[PDB]
Amino acid sequence: QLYSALANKCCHVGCTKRSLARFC
Amino acid sequence: DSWMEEVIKLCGRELVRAQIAICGMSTWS
């Protein structure tokens, strides 16, 4: 899922706070 | 916090905490 993609991404490399911002 | 950028390395519940915080504190442009 998109959230799982974000979850893995942030947990591995990281993500932008702006990225979680567009997800919520 | 900095809504213009920020790159974090969180996971799980902290990730959701950051989400809740970011999406709630969207009072700042």
Curated annotation (Swiss-Prot), chain A:
Domain of life according to the entry: Eukaryota
Naturally occurring in which organism (per UniProt): Homo sapiens
Protein name: Relaxin A chain
Gene from which the chain derives: RLN2
Cystine bridges: C10-C15
